[PDB]
Structure formats: structure tokens, C-alpha cells
């Protein structure tokens, strides 16, 4: 009546002949999980890869949180912590909270506690967060190669769960691209405490994502299948405007904590998870997602690509084109970078690239037909690829250029993209340059090799 639970999402307990490639499996299991936007996976009872660290030399910064629902959060950025030294302020602000012994509090009454917490404008409770990309002052909880290594730690090195591989295996498409994109293709590590909290987002590009507990208590998820992600956000301008004006880059993208339950109302669908110790969450594109944590803990999480993702990779950066987004890469770059590679690709892979770069080069076409019935006529190719992102963003739709944009020399620098032809200055078209990464001539080879490829 206060808090009515969501269904519970899709838990999967592969064997180990399922378990030893995780991109099969996830395929697999995508008929199902899709429906759901988040899923669980809990591993063969023997995996177990080890954790160690020392708790006294890892140090961070977390961010401070309040707790209040609709309020508007940044997705990024008092006080440095140790890893000891959060755990004991964390176990403590959890015992002192319930007057309890941590273990003994019900996780069904931690939750409806924190949605009885982020309700109530009486209640200020403020709590803090870790959230910190993998770096040598804070590494991976899996075990990467260094250190002299154990042979529990070498068995667990090469594996597609260890979440360092993942990214750069031949199956995420993540792992082709040249532009560094450090926040899509390392880890990110995340110290958990009692109702420290993830507001509703989904991935950038619409990815995927994956997240291991490695140990601590429980993290709360909700999630809400791609297909109903528009409802979701069509509810959330209604009751929280303010977060759906447009942000002046990636740094200033706002979210909130919003109950289930709202959603729900809204006939929106709405799934649930306790993740516990050494299970993954995974969610699918466009899914959104969120949640809290139960009590002191650490997580380790990294976003990926599947062939099965290329299309809605596309159909994302359209998306970000209509909303003035910015991206974290080009799309075009990178499918491009795939078709260079063509007699190194994965087979299979091949095959998928090669039907994308059917659709851009035929939409590249059409656009360039265009812009020359408006009298751009002098073009000039150009290495969009070497260009910092900043120097080649669309004025208008902040799309990062890369098959072609238009400049003046009126403007130097400028650049739009071919749907903004019209948005760059007052001068006549005739004096403004095509600028193009490759001929269409040259882009039917490079398909072709893809082709060749893929038999
Ligand atoms: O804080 C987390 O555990 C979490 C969960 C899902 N997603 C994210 C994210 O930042 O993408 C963070
Ligand atoms: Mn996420
Ligand atoms: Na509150
Ligand atoms: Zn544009
Ligand atoms: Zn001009």
C-alpha cells in the first residue's frame, strides 16, 4: 500500500558449457531478458574469481548524495576515504540508522524505507557515494596481468566474465574503435553504502551493460525494458521538467530518483532484483535502469557492444541528433574503422558491419543529393577521424561529424552537419565546402571487403 514490490526480472543460472562464452549466452538469453531491460546471472557455484586488496591503501573521493525524490542529480561530480575508513562509516550509518546489527535488517525493509526516505521533505538525510573509472590508484576487483600472480588469479585472467576482457574481446565492437573513449571501455568501480543510490539513465549510445558484486551486501535494481523507454521518459517530463532541458555537454546531463511505483501507474513496466555477492545484473540497450545499495559493498561494471547492437547504435545517434545531444564517438567512425579491418574481423561480425554500412552509405547518398540541390558545389575530402571531437561537432545538433559536414570560409573552424546545411551563416550556399571522409566510390570497396569477408 506503501511500496508494492515490482515483479522480480529474469534470473539465469547457466551451466558451464552455457557460462564459458559470455556473448553466446547473452544472445541467447535476449529474447527474454529484452523484455525486462535488466536480468541477472548467477555464475557456476565454482567460479569464484578472487578479490584482493588492501583495504588501508585504496583511497577515493566519493560524491555526497541527498536523497530526495524528482530532485534533479548530475551523472558525474568533501572528503577523501579509504576504503577501511568508508566501511566504517558506512557499517556505522546503517547500524545507527535502523538501531540494528547491519545483517539483521530485512532487505525488504531497507527498500521500503528508502522510498518512504526520498518521499518525505522532513527527512534530509544525506549519504555518500563511490564512483571511480579503474586506474592505477584504483584498479580492477578482477585480476589483470602486472605483480607476480597466483594460480587462482591466472585461471580467472583470460576469462569473457572477467570484465577487463569484455570490452577489448573481438565481440564487443567497443574494442575496434581507435578514439580513446575511456569511459565506455574501462570499468568503473563503485563502493556502495546503506541507500547510496543510481538514478534512472540508460547507457550512452544505448549500450549494454554489466555489473559484478563483488562482495558487500545487496544492490537494489529497478529496470524498464527498451521498448517502453520513451513511456518512462514521457512520464518524467510530465512530473520533473526541469531535467529534460537540454545540457551544454556530457558534464551536465541531469537525472533523479523516481519511485517504481509511479511508473507503474503510468502502465509503464517496471522489473526488480536483489544482486547479490558474485552475481552479474546486465542491462540491455536503451534499458532504464536503477537503484540502491543495501549496505557497504563494491561493485565493478563496464559498458559493451554486440553485434545486435550495431542498428540501435545507429538509431541512437539519430536520436541524439533530434534532441541536440552530444556523443561520446562517431558511429560512421567507427563502422568505418571495422570495414579497414575487414580480413581481421570475426566472421559473423563481418556481416553484421557490412548491412549498417549498406544503410549509412545509402543515407550518405541521399544526403549529399541533397546539399548539392541547395548549390554547395566545391568539396574537398578531408580526415574528419584527426580533428579533436570539439572541433568537428555539429553548431546545430552537436552530432560529432565524420562521413561529411559543410564549412565557410566566413567561419573558419565552423562546421554543420548535412541536415543543417542551412544553420552554418548567411552566405550564399555557393561559397560554403562539402567536406567528405571518402568518395562514394571509395566506400563500395571498402563494403566489399566486408562482403569477401563474411562469405
Ligand atoms: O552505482 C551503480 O551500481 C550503477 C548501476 C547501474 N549503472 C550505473 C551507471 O553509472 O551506469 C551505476
Ligand atoms: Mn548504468
Ligand atoms: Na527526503
Ligand atoms: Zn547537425
Ligand atoms: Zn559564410
Excluded at 529474469?10 to 529484452?34: L, T
Excluded at 562521413?403 to 544553420?423: D, F, N, Q, R, T
Aim: contains cysteine; proline residues 7%.
Amino acid at each position: 500500500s506503501m511500496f508494492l514490490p515490482p515483479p522480480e526480472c529474469p534470473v539465469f543460472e547457466p551451466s558451464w558449457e552455457e557460462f564459458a562464452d559470455p556473448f553466446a549466452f547473452i544472445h541467447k538469453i535476449r529474447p527474454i531478458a529484452e523484455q525486462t531491460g535488466i536480468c541477472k546471472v548467477r555464475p557456476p557455484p565454482d567460479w569464484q574469481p578472487p578479490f584482493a586488496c588492501d583495504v588501508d591503501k585504496l583511497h577515493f573521493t566519493p560524491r555526497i548524495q541527498r536523497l530526495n525524490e524528482l530532485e534533479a542529480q548530475t551523472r558525474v561530480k568533501a572528503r577523501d576515504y579509504t576504503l577501511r575508513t568508508f566501511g566504517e562509516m558506512a557499517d556505522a550509518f546503517k547500524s545507527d540508522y535502523f538501531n540494528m546489527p547491519v545483517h539483521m535488517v530485512p532487505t525488504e525493509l531497507v527498500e521500503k524505507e528508502f522510498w518512504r526516505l526520498v518521499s518525505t521533505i522532513e527527512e534530509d538525510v544525506t549519504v555518500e557515494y563511490g564512483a571511480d573509472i579503474a586506474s592505477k590508484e584504483f584498479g580492477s576487483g578482477f585480476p589483470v596481468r602486472d605483480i607476480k600472480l597466483s594460480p587462482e588469479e591466472e585461471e580467472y585472467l583470460d576469462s569473457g566474465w572477467n570484465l577487463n576482457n569484455m570490452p577489448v574481446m573481438e565481440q564487443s565492437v567497443l574494442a575496434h574503435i581507435t578514439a580513446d573513449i575511456c569511459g565506455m571501455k574501462l570499468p568503473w568501480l563503485y563502493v556502495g553504502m546503506c541507500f547510496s543510490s543510481f538514478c534512472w539513465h540508460i547507457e550512452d549510445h544505448w549500450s549494454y551493460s554489466i555489473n559484478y558484486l563483488h562482495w558487500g551486501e545487496p544492490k537494489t535494481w529497478y529496470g524498464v525494458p527498451g521498448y517502453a523507454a520513451e513511456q518512462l521518459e514521457n512520464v518524467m517530463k510530465k512530473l520533473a521538467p526541469e531535467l529534460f532541458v537540454s545540457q551544454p555537454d556530457l558534464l551536465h546531463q541531469l537525472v533523479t530518483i523516481m519511485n517504481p511505483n509511479t511508473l507503474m501507474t503510468h502502465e509503464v513496466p517496471v522489473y526488480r532484483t536483489n544482486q547479490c555477492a558474485g552475481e552479474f545484473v546486465i542491462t540491455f540497450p536503451r534499458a532504464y535502469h536503477s537503484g540502491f545499495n543495501q549496505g557497504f559493498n563494491f561493485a565493478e561494471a563496464v559498458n559493451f557492444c554486440t553485434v545486435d547492437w550495431l542498428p540501435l547504435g545507429r538509431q541512437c545517434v539519430e536520436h541524439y541528433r533530434l534532441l541536440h545531444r552530444y556523443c561520446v564517438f562517431s558511429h560512421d567512425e567507427m563502422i568505418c574503422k571495422m570495414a579497414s579491418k575487414a580480413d581481421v574481423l570475426d566472421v559473423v561480425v563481418a556481416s553484421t558491419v557490412q548491412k549498417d554500412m549498406a544503410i549509412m552509405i545509402e543515407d550518405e547518398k541521399a544526403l549529399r543529393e541533397t546539399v548539392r540541390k541547395l548549390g554547395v558545389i566545391d568539396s574537398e575530402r578531408m580526415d574528419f577521424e584527426l580533428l579533436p571531437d570539439d572541433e568537428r561537432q555539429c553548431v546545430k545538433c552537436k552530432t560529432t561529424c565524420f562521413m561529411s559536414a559543410i564549412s565557410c570560409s566566413c567561419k573558419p573552424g565552423l562546421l554543420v552537419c548535412l541536415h543543417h546545411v542551412k544553420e552554418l551563416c548567411s552566405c550564399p550556399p555557393y561559397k560554403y565546402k562539402l567536406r567528405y571522409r571518402y568518395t562514394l566510390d571509395d566506400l563500395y570497396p571498402m563494403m566489399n571487403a566486408l562482403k569477401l569477408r563474411a562469405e
